[PDB]
Design a protein around this ligand. Sequence first.
Ligand SMILES: CC(C)[C@H](NC(=O)COc1ccccc1)C(=O)N[C@@H](Cc1ccccc1)[C@@H](O)[C@H](N)[C@H](O)Cc1ccccc1
Lengths: 99, 99
Amino acid sequence: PQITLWKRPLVTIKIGGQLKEALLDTGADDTVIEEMSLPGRWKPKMIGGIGGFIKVRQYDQIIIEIAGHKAIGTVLVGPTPVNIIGRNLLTQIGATLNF
Amino acid sequence: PQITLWKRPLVTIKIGGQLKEALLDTGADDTVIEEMSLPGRWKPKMIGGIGGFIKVRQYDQIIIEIAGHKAIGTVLVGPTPVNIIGRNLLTQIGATLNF
Ligand SMILES: CC(C)[C@H](NC(=O)COc1ccccc1)C(=O)N[C@@H](Cc1ccccc1)[C@@H](O)[C@H](N)[C@H](O)Cc1ccccc1
């Protein structure tokens, strides 16, 4: 679809078989999802955002659906304030910015 | 224009008589620019995201050109790690996400 930006670009995702809401976030390199139980192997990682750095669990090669579109890639799981779909998965679904 | 997301979507902006590089950020409600000496009155604000909050100065009705497109609106100034163009200004330049 084409998504305008008057409201937050929130979409439904399916991850680990569960529905969640997430923000399509062109300003994020990575995808970061709130704490959850997720099938797959992980390793500790640190990432930074506007306010500093946090600890997350890095899961590679995770199958996820974003507004109905398939991606398989890295998902970081940790205490993010909002679920964010970053460029690593936006590129997989063919998203671009247009103006 | 169309901007793909393989790399950070950085564009040139003009603000306060200076050229800067900034990130087009669909995940940002607000526009946050690196410390600069903008003229006139402002209001204290705190903004947050991953990592916590930072303190910024809120300036209203700031004239800003984004990749050649004129805009006018609120700009937050402070110790951000990257200049961020958020939805308050992305809407003014008619930006969408498309997939
Ligand atoms: C800029 C902020 C006003 C923006 N936040 C928001 O727009 C809303 O912030 C909150 C905070 C708490 C609860 C609900 C909403 C934000 O952090 N936006 C981020 C996503 C986000 C995180 C947490 C909450 C909401 C959004 C990103 O789009 C962020 N601007 C990029 O990662 C830019 C970046 C790249 C590299 C280093 C540092 C920063």
